[PDB]
Design a protein around this ligand. Structure first.
Ligand SMILES: *[C@@H]1O[C@H](CO)[C@@H](O)[C@H](O)[C@H]1NC(C)=O
Length: 261
């Protein structure tokens, strides 16, 4: 399946919303769903990866490669010096490494490695970006576009701007697909830069908890109370599926049956 493209250089709300829909429909297991929310496949599916190509206003591109099962970025490529340059995290090794290497940059064409000399966890990226928290890194359509120009085709770029590009790209592509609330935060602030509020970071950190809770809900009631945070950082207690369902776009894979609808 198809490489999904998003042009951040000439974007509209509607084009971003189409991109989210396309990404959610390619990523979801077509059979799996709980309370009408699509679920991601587990690790042994037919197609294990997705490629997402981003284009800046400079017309330069970066392609992200995502694990389909959890939408984590494994690496990215950019056109550099008439070669496909591939950038992979330092903890991707063996069979995954070379599925990544060869899917971003086919063997039959010139290529060159430029490693990411760290892993992709949010704590790691925040330290390389020089922040205590990622709410200090602003998000936005213009920022995503400008960050692509700073890396794509450049012989040298710092680990600080690469770790900031990956904090913006992971939240605007992967977290936005997992959560309709973070997608709606990008559309609400489409014409401006903005900081992720406390509900955006809390949902990102509790995607696995939320997915297990919904899956195990009986008749729409969560197994036990789920303590999340509101946009302003105050405590939010969730007791029923329909209370959290407007903010969720995709479920992590949870084994067993659940109420489909
Ligand atoms: C996954 O769920 C199936 C169906 O209930 C069950 O048979 C199997 O034991 C489960 N696998 C794991 C690893 O728990």
């Amino acid at each position: 399946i198809n490489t999904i493209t998003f042009d951040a250089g000439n974007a509209t709300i509607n084009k971003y919303a189409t991109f989210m829909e396309s990404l959610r429909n390619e990523a979801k297991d077509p059979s799996l769903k709980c309370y009408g929310i699509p679920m991601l496949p587990n690790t042994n599916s037919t197609i294990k990866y997705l490629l997402v190509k981003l284009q800046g206003a400079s017309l330069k591109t970066i392609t992200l490669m995502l694990r389909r099962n959890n939408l984590y970025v494994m690496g990215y490529s950019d056109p550099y010096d008439n070669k496909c340059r591939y950038h992979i995290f330092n903890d991707i090794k063996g069979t995954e490494y070379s599925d990544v290497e060869n899917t971003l940059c086919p063997s039959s064409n010139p290529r060159v490695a430029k490693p990411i000399n760290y892993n992709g966890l949010y704590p790691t990226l925040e330290k390389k970006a020089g922040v205590t928290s990622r709410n200090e890194v602003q998000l936005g359509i213009q920022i995503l576009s400008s960050d692509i120009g700073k890396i794509s085709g450049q012989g040298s770029f710092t680990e600080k701007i690469e770790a900031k590009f990956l904090l913006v790209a992971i939240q605007m592509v992967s977290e936005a697909a997992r959560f309709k609330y973070i997608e709606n935060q990008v559309k609400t602030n489409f014409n401006r830069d903005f900081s992720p509020n406390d509900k955006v970071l809390d949902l990102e950190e509790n995607w696995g908890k939320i997915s297990t809770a919904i899956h195990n809900s009986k008749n729409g009631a969560l197994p036990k109370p789920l303590e999340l945070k509101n946009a302003d950082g105050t405590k939010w207690i969730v007791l029923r599926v329909d209370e959290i369902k407007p903010d969720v776009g995709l479920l992590n894979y949870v084994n067993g049956t659940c109420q489909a609808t």
